[PDB]
Design a protein around this ligand. Structure first.
Ligand SMILES: CO[C@H]1O[C@H](Cn2cc(CSC[C@H]3O[C@@H](S[C@@H]4O[C@H](CO)[C@H](O)[C@H](O)[C@H]4O)[C@H](O)[C@@H](O)[C@@H]3O)nn2)[C@@H](O)[C@H](O)[C@H]1O
Ligand SMILES: CO[C@H]1O[C@H](Cn2cc(CSC[C@H]3O[C@@H](S[C@@H]4O[C@H](CO)[C@H](O)[C@H](O)[C@H]4O)[C@H](O)[C@@H](O)[C@@H]3O)nn2)[C@@H](O)[C@H](O)[C@H]1O
Ligand SMILES: CO[C@H]1O[C@H](Cn2cc(CSC[C@H]3O[C@@H](S[C@@H]4O[C@H](CO)[C@H](O)[C@H](O)[C@H]4O)[C@H](O)[C@@H](O)[C@@H]3O)nn2)[C@@H](O)[C@H](O)[C@H]1O
Ligand SMILES: CO[C@H]1O[C@H](Cn2cc(CSC[C@H]3O[C@@H](S[C@@H]4O[C@H](CO)[C@H](O)[C@H](O)[C@H]4O)[C@H](O)[C@@H](O)[C@@H]3O)nn2)[C@@H](O)[C@H](O)[C@H]1O
Ligand SMILES: [Ca+2]
Ligand SMILES: [Ca+2]
Ligand SMILES: [Ca+2]
Ligand SMILES: [Ca+2]
Ligand SMILES: [Mn+2]
Ligand SMILES: [Mn+2]
Ligand SMILES: [Mn+2]
Ligand SMILES: [Mn+2]
Lengths: 232, 232, 232, 232
């Protein structure tokens, strides 16, 4: 079997293992800050630099994966706390969309909300243009920020949030468990055919964005991942 | 919302949070040993002592849960390494079945392989009488040790195994990710309607068994659990 | 180490984590109302259902704990605002004393004011029979509603009160900080040997009572608790 | 009564309510980082800018207080994670000791470990010169980093730690409860006569230090405080 495994307890600027895109910076404490608090339509993304083979064209086999990460969103004075973080999967050549308006696009889609990715968004602003539910939510996205499915959630300013994701290749199920500060868990699951929506090799990572009036601290604190593709 | 949250980094006798059933002992290192290596058809089970309200007849709501545990199975001289461990959910009055033959029943079912439980088994012996697959396997069990679904797996003697389980109440999906010693991940997922198969109040735990010729060390090393029920 | 931890942001009927005793009800907003406003000598108590092992006869070790809760007392028309709330610790078999007169006994003691418990009372009626100070007071109680120590306090009708309690096992100190509506803090601390006054296994909870002419709303709004016992 | 009350969910270097001393910086995420990771014998301290009157030469009365704060210590590559954080109380003219060697002094004492302060240290290095216990520990310090009392503790890299402190003026007891990431609680309490050891007006704050080979990330995430002095 073919296994990709890594663990980040902290992150650093001089690390070739991470691709830094756009407005992302690494703080002295080791956290990744995705957006620039002084920039209009700020977009920042991080990707695990090695492409991951999620399916084989030879066997037709699809990989399963288990991933865990921790993040924090914090309100800043005079700005609407927006727009949120998306944990995404995309083709290995993925870049911030050209002329990205940030905001509701979460740095992965065009103005109409379309792109080439599969993601788990932690959405803190209701964009009517992307049919967002009225409150903070966790969504499962397939090539669109107009989520296939959402669950109500609450983004607590300055709270450390823990996420666990399981992709089961046999049932094609993407399952997410989110652990809040008040200790409650929020879950969301959706059948997503990764072999049909994404290429053989993909990159995994995080994206966040803001607009002129919508900005907040988006921090990635830790990330562990394991994928296993059966090679028989 | 109604949340049950606990964490065991180790265990101890006299801890009122744990119900000990049958042949279970607590080792000096804090590990729970489920079976007695000198007993024929040994059965040992541990349960979280407090009943958990997994669903409500008033709202129709079903809880979601995130749980993680680590276990170890070790071969002993002469005996066939058997029979395995099951992480199970059952009515709050659950007891080892009367006249239990241990073995392939994994301490949760009768001789015909039937019982009242939902479980995730880590099965190390192929029982043709319960239509077991030919190799070691992880199974999803619904009132029977004749699994609704299995996945090939490999039980490595003396290896510490990590498990993560997500139950998403909205899709009724039970998703399991198993992390082996060699670094590979094994997953299995099944739609299981807990509200249809179990009562409102349940107990969560682990069970293991052996026969005359089939015996091995079955150890529970750690257990964390969070369940949330929407109260509306 | 052996740790018991929980956090209630709200409450619900049928939650098996909570034992309801006497006249307790759960309001639609999630608050617990301890007494029945239409009953003479009303007594209501809530207990965390799982026993907590506060000390071990084998090691001689005593647990430390940290707990925080919020409550509200509100006057009702015609009745004298009485009698108050007690946060208490008692043997795991604890029940409302048989033939309880409610009132100044706070639902934990007999008519002479004696019982088997350790508590922190938020007393709103001066019972000369229990040597109560002349004004509202916070008291530390050891097997009696005739407090070992009190501090003057003021119970404001309809005000949300926040309490924090620390028990340090090494010094045997029970420390209490009460945050009033006007922003001031009230503290009270007393050396209490829990190992000498209580059994190994105990229950934690809240009790409130009233009399014929002494009735008020007694509400428990939230409760978080963590205890840790050092094990062999 | 005289009450001082404040709450910090985030900190800014610009704000006048806080005094910055030495190598302290404010990160864009709002956290205070006490030491400079690239400096030998780095010392950084923070203080609530307004002096708080803890006792009165007119009445003899001593204030009680309740304070809560959260911190994080994180390991850095190639350096020994040292030396720790101290929550301290000192005269209003307090400054980093002249020619401070950082290290085991925690930025509050001279080379011999003496100074003018009362503190709660979260010590991560064993300095035999200050009679430190062999493991990580929480200590209560009175004019010395040779603690009046310590309790074994464990500093987990990248873990958010919650602390609650109660000072009860009547018993002169300083009680501390520390909530770890593994869920366990650590407590320590000591009788400290603040009137005898400190002036009437004092400053409250945090200090951290490192040395040549001993460095780590020291972060203050939040801080709440309330003190009440009886003026009758
Ligand atoms: C008739 O057709 C023409 O005229 C249209 C008329 N129009 C448009 C408008 C106002 S547009 C809505 C508001 O939106 C925010 S952006 C928003 O901020 C959030 C944080 O609060 C989040 O970050 C979120 O993600 C992000 O999207 C702006 O800043 C603000 O100024 C503006 O009022 N008012 N009139 C125009 O649309 C057409 O193109 C053009 O052809
Ligand atoms: C015609 O009908 C009558 O005769 C039947 C005839 N029978 C039965 C048998 C042999 S039964 C199979 C073997 O099984 C193991 S048990 C096994 O060990 C594993 C570890 O290796 C695992 O732990 C596993 O979980 C556990 O099940 C025994 O120990 C061993 O001795 C035995 O040969 N041989 N003939 C009988 O069935 C009927 O009731 C009766 O009416
Ligand atoms: C000589 O000996 C005999 O005669 C005694 C004579 N007695 C007794 C009395 C009056 S007893 C005091 C008053 O008390 C309240 S109860 C009170 O209400 C509060 C709210 O306002 C709080 O809730 C508080 O906690 C609760 O206690 C009653 O309702 C009220 O009617 C009554 O006047 N008057 N005479 C009797 O004691 C002896 O047993 C008997 O042998
Ligand atoms: C005979 O008398 C003369 O000779 C003495 C002889 N000496 C001294 C020494 C070695 S001194 C001990 C070691 O200490 C660390 S500092 C330490 O780092 C920690 C992180 O790991 C923490 O941060 C902690 O807080 C901090 O204290 C240094 O970096 C390292 O190089 C050094 O070996 N070796 N010989 C000298 O003492 C006298 O003054 C002088 O008169
Ligand atoms: Ca949005
Ligand atoms: Ca089997
Ligand atoms: Ca009274
Ligand atoms: Ca030290
Ligand atoms: Mn959305
Ligand atoms: Mn099986
Ligand atoms: Mn009283
Ligand atoms: Mn020390």
């Amino acid at each position: 079997a073919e296994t990709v495994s890594f663990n980040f307890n902290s992150f650093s600027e001089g690390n070739p293992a991470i691709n830094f895109q756009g407005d992302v910076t690494v703080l002295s404490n080791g956290n990744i800050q995705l957006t620039n608090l002084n920039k209009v339509n700020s977009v920042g993304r991080v990707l695990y630099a090695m492409p991951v083979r999620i399916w084989s064209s030879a066997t037709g086999n699809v990989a399963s994966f288990l991933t865990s990460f921790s993040f924090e969103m914090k309100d800043i004075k005079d700005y609407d706390p927006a727009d949120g973080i998306i944990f995404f999967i995309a083709p290995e050549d993925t870049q911030i969309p050209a002329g990205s308006i940030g905001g509701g696009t979460l740095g992965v889609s065009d103005t109409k909300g379309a792109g080439h990715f599969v993601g788990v968004e932690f959405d803190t602003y209701s964009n009517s243009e992307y049919n967002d539910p009225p409150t903070d939510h966790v969504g499962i996205d397939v090539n669109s920020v107009d989520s296939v499915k959402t669950v109500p959630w609450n983004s607590v300013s300055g709270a450390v949030v823990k996420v666990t994701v399981i992709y089961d290749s046999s049932t094609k199920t993407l399952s997410v468990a989110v652990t809040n500060d008040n200790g409650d868990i929020t879950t969301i699951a959706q059948v997503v055919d990764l072999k049909a929506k994404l290429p053989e090799r993909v990159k995994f990572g995080f994206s966040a964005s803001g607009s002129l009036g919508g900005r907040q601290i988006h921090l990635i604190r830790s990330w562990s991942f394991t994928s296993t593709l059966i090679t028989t």
